[PDB]
Amino acid sequence: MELLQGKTFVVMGVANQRSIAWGIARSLHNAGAKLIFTYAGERLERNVRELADTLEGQESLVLPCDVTNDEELTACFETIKQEVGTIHGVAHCIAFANRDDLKGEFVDTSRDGFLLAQNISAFSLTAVAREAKKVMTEGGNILTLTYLGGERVVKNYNVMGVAKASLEASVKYLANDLGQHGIRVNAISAGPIRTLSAKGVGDFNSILREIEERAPLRRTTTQEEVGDTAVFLFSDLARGVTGENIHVDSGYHILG
Amino acid sequence: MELLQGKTFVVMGVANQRSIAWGIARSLHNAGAKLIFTYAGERLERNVRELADTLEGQESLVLPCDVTNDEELTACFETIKQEVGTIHGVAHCIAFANRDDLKGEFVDTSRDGFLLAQNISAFSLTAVAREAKKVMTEGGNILTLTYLGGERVVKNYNVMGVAKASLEASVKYLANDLGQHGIRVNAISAGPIRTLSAKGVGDFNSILREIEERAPLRRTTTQEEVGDTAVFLFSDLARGVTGENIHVDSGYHILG
Amino acid sequence: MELLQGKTFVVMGVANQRSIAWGIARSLHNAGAKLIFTYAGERLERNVRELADTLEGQESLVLPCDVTNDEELTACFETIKQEVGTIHGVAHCIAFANRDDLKGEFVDTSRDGFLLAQNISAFSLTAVAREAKKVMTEGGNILTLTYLGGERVVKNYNVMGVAKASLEASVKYLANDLGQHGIRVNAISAGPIRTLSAKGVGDFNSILREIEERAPLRRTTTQEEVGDTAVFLFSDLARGVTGENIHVDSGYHILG
Amino acid sequence: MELLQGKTFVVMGVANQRSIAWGIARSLHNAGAKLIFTYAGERLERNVRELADTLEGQESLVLPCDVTNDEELTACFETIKQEVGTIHGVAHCIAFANRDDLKGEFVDTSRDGFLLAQNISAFSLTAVAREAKKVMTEGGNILTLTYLGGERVVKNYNVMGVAKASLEASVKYLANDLGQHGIRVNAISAGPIRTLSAKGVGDFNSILREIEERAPLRRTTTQEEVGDTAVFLFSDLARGVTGENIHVDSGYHILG
């Protein structure tokens, strides 16, 4: 509860209280971290500011950052650098795909939808790392969130599965790049969690019940389980760990 | 010598006599197949045509097909359908990334370069499969070519490594989609081979020397070794094999 | 039907007409190979000789070979050397574990049952390779059979899953050893097939139904599909392929 | 710091203060854990008793446990049960192979050397878990240590690589078994560290220099980096993590 004392992290991707990013924010806060939040656009600004305010302590900086927009991304981290001076990591909790691509067969994925999913769900990690690198003057960790669907075929995940494969490969190439600067890059592969974006995946309740039935720990995962693993990865306990993908999924990933 | 007797395959991605696609074409021809060739633009028409000419026992069908162009892709396979009625598979031997992206550090990859590499090197397999599906009425195999860099970090591969991870995930999701229609989808992961596109990968002679020194078979791969593995995957011998990635790389992939 | 003309292979592990080894033998024969058969003990001798006699041509050499017995393993391959002088490959189709260890929880596996499974199902590949190397003076391929349960957790497989992990790792270390001598080592990972040994695995009809319902090709594998992939791996077509594990499982391995 | 307050762990495999198990013991101690130690035989008893003394005083429970000896192993955990009643985890840091089997080509591995390596380095995890299960009534975590050589071919590791493949598969099958009882099972894959047993692996200085040059973090790993990841896996922070293999190896595992 003082593992992250004296450290500041940027948390990207809070949309509401069910967001995995908000679970991460709570765990980081509870471990003593100061937090900077970024939100996608005006629609979500008050949700994020209100949640940030429920944390006790100094008021958290809350900034707009649409990761499809290089100008805004650059400006966002320039502001951060000037206002706080040093950060020790970034939690990248961002993905998007068109729902029409998610519903159809994968072979019917639109070109524009494929590239949009790649842009937001995979390339944005690299765009973010490029700007974050400048502010992580003492090193630290960059974290992203992935899903089993990026490693193997899971139903109704389709275009997002292929985007997560890009993301997981990006984690490795970024780790190899940034390690010499003392920056680690890792992923958490979370099991299914009911979030705002989970509605894009078909019959989510069958999926949850399947986890309960078959996963080794016989229960579904929580935002807090993901956040507590994020606490480890952002801490000095994980200083030897980079380019890794830790499954926080009740062991489901081992099943064949 | 007769494994592919009576079957016709579309080979995409011949550019010159060193192209892996040309090794695949020659092997398929040696196993009794008839071949159709597509070429990327006007600058390649004559060369692809000259090579296609040297296949005895058949006349040439050689068509323009820019896989970024949906109207042309659709028209190309409609022409194929009208000319031969049924094909039994497609060899997708196509990739591209900007030189400046391949030379820099991965973290400095441009957004447009990333999406361009994804479009041409990964999404195009899906775009091709969607059209090929219409002409593969007796089932068959769709093959693509990948590289170890899509699985693990290899030097000077960067944005292409991430595009190959995307391509390999696509192979799996497409296999899952098309299998019910009797269409298999597989990759060959080739070891380094001196081709036109190898010029964009830096220090290639030393990469080859590394294979020679360290690979289990103590030698570099050839276009013909890849071609002969394609013969298998396109044949009835591989009718139980789909969603697979066969390394044709002198064993190098097993090394830690 | 001439891929393997002029070549001689030792097929180990035929027990009856449903044995995967017998699928492999029929495919290799149809491809022009001469064959040598080994059998586990006196109880199987009749079956194996009867099956071998159904092959057109000169009656195949048939020899006892308990792979737990180093004296007999050595004598067997010395007899092979005196009878045919040179062989071009070996199909290792051998496994065993106590049926109590397959039933109970894996954590209740007995020490002697664990070591017995390792001895027969994993180490025997290496013991066989060491003798085969003496007779494979022109190079060739050594093949073994594995199962998805060596990679991920499959129900009831337990101690055999751990032995297959050991087997798959042995394939890689042997490939690295023997490649410099022109010897390739590969595995086929077969999907579930009703054989004599499949009686040891619980609810087998249920397993086959799941494959039929969920596998990309919507059907279960056959001994012939495995045999035809073995033809590839034993042929010159696969001369660039070593340390590989080819799944012949209707694509099931890709599912998450 | 208080992550493990009020919890007791069994540390197996301390030989001297360079032992990875000793790095683990120190980290657990610093996180507030109470520790029980086991030693292999009388040759190492003094080392282990004295090191245990520095952390726990002369109170400490220090017990003989040759993991090849089922009587002694059972007696060990029976003593733990009636001395402390409940434990919350076990660190299994035990491996052995004959030095001859580590130098010769893998194909020359002796049968009894192979089974010996499997017995001590892989089956012991299962035999330990079967006893630990009885005293882990509040749940917890079982940890083992593995090496990249269990996944891919690393030079001069041979029979131990195959034993680590078995160990890693055992982690998965054990996790699937014990999860329903609230017990997690995980591995740490450590990078090369100069320990007592590292002498078994040839030209170790060369291996270390390789890591320093090429690993993403450009430095070799330490016992403390491993211990601190162990603290995470034994803590409530990792309650969603089971059947996982975390590489603590400066990122080296991502490289191809």
Ligand SMILES: NC(=O)c1ccc[n+]([C@@H]2O[C@H](COP(=O)([O-])OP(=O)(O)OC[C@H]3O[C@@H](n4cnc5c(N)ncnc54)[C@H](O)[C@@H]3O)[C@@H](O)[C@H]2O)c1
């Ligand atoms: N929910 C699950 O079961 C699950 C499982 C595994 C991984 N994940 C991953 O976790 C991450 C967070 O998703 P979630 O489930 O918490 O849902 P969510 O809807 O709460 O979070 C998605 C976030 O992405 C943001 N985003 C989308 N487009 C953006 C853009 N252009 N610029 C900036 N931000 C943008 C949204 O504003 C939102 O905050 C995603 O990467 C998701 O794929 C989720």
Ligand SMILES: NC(=O)c1ccc[n+]([C@@H]2O[C@H](COP(=O)([O-])OP(=O)(O)OC[C@H]3O[C@@H](n4cnc5c(N)ncnc54)[C@H](O)[C@@H]3O)[C@@H](O)[C@H]2O)c1
């Ligand atoms: N050369 C190697 O060492 C190696 C190793 C592994 C994989 N590969 C892969 O093999 C495949 C073939 O590459 P190669 O080495 O034979 O090189 P190459 O340059 O001969 O072939 C690449 C082909 O892609 C085509 N292409 C590019 N953009 C296209 C577009 N818009 N539409 C249609 N075609 C387009 C080019 O015209 C060319 O024919 C690629 O996927 C490559 O990544 C190559």
Ligand SMILES: NC(=O)c1ccc[n+]([C@@H]2O[C@H](COP(=O)([O-])OP(=O)(O)OC[C@H]3O[C@@H](n4cnc5c(N)ncnc54)[C@H](O)[C@@H]3O)[C@@H](O)[C@H]2O)c1
């Ligand atoms: N049947 C399947 O669905 C399936 C799937 C994947 C892999 N496999 C593997 O295929 C291989 C062949 O099994 P199968 O299904 O054909 O069954 P099977 O019972 O027909 O063959 C197993 C063979 O192993 C032999 N064997 C056992 N102990 C031996 C010893 N001490 N010395 C020599 N030979 C010995 C038996 O005599 C028999 O010939 C095994 O490795 C098995 O694990 C089977």
Ligand SMILES: NC(=O)c1ccc[n+]([C@@H]2O[C@H](COP(=O)([O-])OP(=O)(O)OC[C@H]3O[C@@H](n4cnc5c(N)ncnc54)[C@H](O)[C@@H]3O)[C@@H](O)[C@H]2O)c1
């Ligand atoms: N040193 C490294 O670079 C490295 C890297 C990755 C993994 N590992 C693994 O870490 C673990 C600890 O090894 P280490 O490097 O600390 O060396 P070490 O020599 O300090 O520890 C190995 C321990 O195994 C014990 N052991 C051997 N046979 C035993 C038996 N019959 N019963 C009980 N205990 C027995 C020894 O007594 C010793 O305490 C091993 O599993 C090793 O394979 C080591």
Ligand SMILES: Oc1cc(Cl)ccc1Oc1ccc(Cl)cc1Cl
């Ligand atoms: O990756 C996810 C995986 C699961 Cl099981 C549930 C939700 C996920 O998150 C998303 C899914 C689809 C879209 Cl459009 C956007 C996001 Cl954030």
Ligand SMILES: Oc1cc(Cl)ccc1Oc1ccc(Cl)cc1Cl
């Ligand atoms: O994938 C490849 C791998 C290697 Cl080792 C060599 C060449 C390869 O092929 C390409 C590399 C870069 C670009 Cl721009 C396009 C292609 Cl086709």
Ligand SMILES: Oc1cc(Cl)ccc1Oc1ccc(Cl)cc1Cl
């Ligand atoms: O590996 C196998 C996998 C499957 Cl699905 C079915 C049978 C298999 O083969 C065996 C299973 C158990 C034992 Cl005792 C011995 C063998 Cl040969």
Ligand SMILES: Oc1cc(Cl)ccc1Oc1ccc(Cl)cc1Cl
């Ligand atoms: O697994 C290891 C990996 C490395 Cl790089 C170094 C030492 C290791 O540990 C061992 C190696 C050989 C033997 Cl005989 C026993 C053990 Cl404990």
